[PDB]
Design an enzyme around this catalytic site. Sequence first.
Site, mmCIF file in Angstrom:
data_model
loop_
_atom_site.group_PDB
_atom_site.id
_atom_site.type_symbol
_atom_site.label_atom_id
_atom_site.label_comp_id
_atom_site.label_asym_id
_atom_site.label_seq_id
_atom_site.Cartn_x
_atom_site.Cartn_y
_atom_site.Cartn_z
ATOM 1 N N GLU A 26 0.849 -1.187 0.000
ATOM 2 C CA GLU A 26 0.000 0.000 0.000
ATOM 3 C C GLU A 26 0.887 1.240 0.000
ATOM 4 O O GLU A 26 2.005 1.207 0.513
ATOM 5 C CB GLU A 26 -0.895 0.005 1.245
ATOM 6 C CG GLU A 26 -0.118 -0.001 2.556
ATOM 7 C CD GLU A 26 -1.018 0.018 3.777
ATOM 8 O OE1 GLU A 26 -1.727 -0.983 4.015
ATOM 9 O OE2 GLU A 26 -1.015 1.039 4.498
ATOM 10 N N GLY A 27 0.395 2.330 -0.576
ATOM 11 C CA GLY A 27 1.192 3.542 -0.602
ATOM 12 C C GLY A 27 0.671 4.628 -1.526
ATOM 13 O O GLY A 27 -0.494 4.610 -1.926
ATOM 14 N N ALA A 28 1.549 5.571 -1.860
ATOM 15 C CA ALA A 28 1.213 6.695 -2.730
ATOM 16 C C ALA A 28 0.312 6.277 -3.887
ATOM 17 O O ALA A 28 -0.902 6.485 -3.848
ATOM 18 C CB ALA A 28 2.494 7.333 -3.266
ATOM 19 N N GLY A 45 -1.312 3.969 -4.690
ATOM 20 C CA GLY A 45 -2.594 3.411 -4.314
ATOM 21 C C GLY A 45 -2.406 2.054 -3.671
ATOM 22 O O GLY A 45 -2.382 1.940 -2.448
ATOM 23 N N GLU A 46 -2.259 1.025 -4.497
ATOM 24 C CA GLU A 46 -2.069 -0.327 -3.994
ATOM 25 C C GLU A 46 -1.725 -1.328 -5.088
ATOM 26 O O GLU A 46 -2.052 -1.136 -6.259
ATOM 27 C CB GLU A 46 -3.328 -0.801 -3.263
ATOM 28 C CG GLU A 46 -4.614 -0.641 -4.069
ATOM 29 C CD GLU A 46 -5.784 -1.401 -3.463
ATOM 30 O OE1 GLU A 46 -6.012 -1.260 -2.240
ATOM 31 O OE2 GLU A 46 -6.478 -2.134 -4.207
ATOM 32 N N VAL A 47 -1.049 -2.396 -4.682
ATOM 33 C CA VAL A 47 -0.667 -3.470 -5.580
ATOM 34 C C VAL A 47 -1.353 -4.706 -5.039
ATOM 35 O O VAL A 47 -1.146 -5.087 -3.886
ATOM 36 C CB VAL A 47 0.849 -3.711 -5.575
ATOM 37 C CG1 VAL A 47 1.175 -4.949 -6.400
ATOM 38 C CG2 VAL A 47 1.570 -2.495 -6.129
ATOM 39 N N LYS A 92 -1.468 -3.131 -10.161
ATOM 40 C CA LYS A 92 -1.329 -1.814 -9.559
ATOM 41 C C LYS A 92 -2.598 -1.038 -9.882
ATOM 42 O O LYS A 92 -3.096 -1.093 -11.009
ATOM 43 C CB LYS A 92 -0.108 -1.099 -10.141
ATOM 44 C CG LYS A 92 0.180 0.263 -9.535
ATOM 45 C CD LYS A 92 1.439 0.864 -10.141
ATOM 46 C CE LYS A 92 1.818 2.173 -9.473
ATOM 47 N NZ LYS A 92 3.112 2.707 -9.987
ATOM 48 N N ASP A 129 15.376 5.822 -10.173
ATOM 49 C CA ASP A 129 14.899 5.628 -8.819
ATOM 50 C C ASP A 129 15.195 4.234 -8.292
ATOM 51 O O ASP A 129 14.359 3.584 -7.665
ATOM 52 C CB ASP A 129 13.409 5.949 -8.721
ATOM 53 C CG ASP A 129 12.955 6.133 -7.283
ATOM 54 O OD1 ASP A 129 13.756 6.630 -6.460
ATOM 55 O OD2 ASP A 129 11.795 5.786 -6.980
HETATM 56 C C1 LIG Z 1 3.759 -4.080 -3.612
HETATM 57 O O1 LIG Z 1 4.745 -4.961 -4.152
HETATM 58 C C2 LIG Z 1 4.896 -6.260 -3.595
HETATM 59 C C3 LIG Z 1 4.921 -6.595 -2.167
HETATM 60 C C4 LIG Z 1 5.084 -7.954 -1.732
HETATM 61 C C5 LIG Z 1 5.228 -8.984 -2.717
HETATM 62 CL CL1 LIG Z 1 5.425 -10.633 -2.226
HETATM 63 C C6 LIG Z 1 5.208 -8.694 -4.117
HETATM 64 C C7 LIG Z 1 5.042 -7.325 -4.560
HETATM 65 N N1 LIG Z 1 5.016 -6.991 -5.902
HETATM 66 C C8 LIG Z 1 4.800 -7.670 -7.128
HETATM 67 O O2 LIG Z 1 4.560 -8.880 -7.170
HETATM 68 N N2 LIG Z 1 4.856 -6.972 -8.312
HETATM 69 C C9 LIG Z 1 5.095 -5.630 -8.607
HETATM 70 C C10 LIG Z 1 5.748 -5.225 -9.840
HETATM 71 N N3 LIG Z 1 5.971 -3.863 -10.110
HETATM 72 C C11 LIG Z 1 5.560 -2.883 -9.188
HETATM 73 C C12 LIG Z 1 4.898 -3.263 -7.937
HETATM 74 O O3 LIG Z 1 4.466 -2.288 -7.001
HETATM 75 C C13 LIG Z 1 5.196 -1.080 -6.789
HETATM 76 C C14 LIG Z 1 4.352 0.103 -7.295
HETATM 77 C C15 LIG Z 1 5.446 -0.989 -5.259
HETATM 78 N N4 LIG Z 1 6.853 -0.932 -4.777
HETATM 79 C C16 LIG Z 1 7.407 0.421 -4.883
HETATM 80 C C17 LIG Z 1 7.744 -1.884 -5.471
HETATM 81 N N5 LIG Z 1 4.677 -4.643 -7.670
#
Ligand SMILES: COc1ccc(Cl)cc1NC(=O)Nc1cncc(O[C@@H](C)CN(C)C)n1
EC number: 2.7.11.1
Length: 269
Positions: free
Chosen positions: A16-18, A20-22, A37, A129
């Site tokens: 969760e964050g800026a 929104g959410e993943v 996302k 970044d």
């Molecule tokens: C929120 O991200 C998490 C947290 C825990 C786990 Cl086990 C997997 C993911 N992401 C993914 O599987 N995939 C993914 C791929 N690209 C970006 C993104 O989310 C970003 C926007 C969040 N942070 C900054 C990485 N997530």
Amino acid sequence: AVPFVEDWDLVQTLGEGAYGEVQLAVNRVTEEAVAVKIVDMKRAVDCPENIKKEICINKMLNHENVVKFYGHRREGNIQYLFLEYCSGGELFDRIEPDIGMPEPDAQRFFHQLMAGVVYLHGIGITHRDIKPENLLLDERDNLKISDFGLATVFRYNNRERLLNKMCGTLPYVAPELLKRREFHAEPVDVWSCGIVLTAMLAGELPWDQPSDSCQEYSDWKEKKTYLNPWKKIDSAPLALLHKILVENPSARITIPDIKKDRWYNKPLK
Ligand SMILES: COc1ccc(Cl)cc1NC(=O)Nc1cncc(O[C@@H](C)CN(C)C)n1
């Protein structure tokens, strides 16, 4: 024409964050897993460099150390992003505060970090970044770079475009980005990888930013690698860091040379 194959169940939230959410998405039939996302909108003076840019660039990316982009879907205000699922998580959480992690793994993550950057640069794209929270891990602990919402092309048609827009995260940002009007994109990502290196082999960040007005950054440039933050880093890797965190971006080491580093090609250690 297997039915229901296009429906994905949003099993859970991964972060969760800026933005929104993943959310973790699981196919209704096949049961494959992906990352979704969810956002809305943002800025306008440079719309092409917004949610649209994160999409355009992702559409070019294809490498085993770069988060795979599956597709997008608009919904008036709801913008869905289909990214690769990384059951591993953010490299950030694999770094014990104050301690870091075993040199071996660090080197392993650094190797894969270099491959992605080499690739991205290979195709004229800079991340801007790079940090432990934008480095995901999969089931086999393979390093995947994510979040290209700040990424921009710095070479098009074999011509390099210098940068001037300050983007990134202060602690991971190179010094020439706060002291210069324009600078080269490539050396800016090396500096960040370096800061990531020091985070993995010490569990802490050197300075709040690469400015002389910052204490630790002045001690660094003074070689006071005793007692200080680098005290916890072995001399082989620390030597490489002496080569990465070099103020003058033109003096700063390059990816091709980093792969020639002693610690970089040192077995296990
Ligand atoms: C929120 O991200 C998490 C947290 C825990 C786990 Cl086990 C997997 C993911 N992401 C993914 O599987 N995939 C993914 C791929 N690209 C970006 C993104 O989310 C970003 C926007 C969040 N942070 C900054 C990485 N997530």
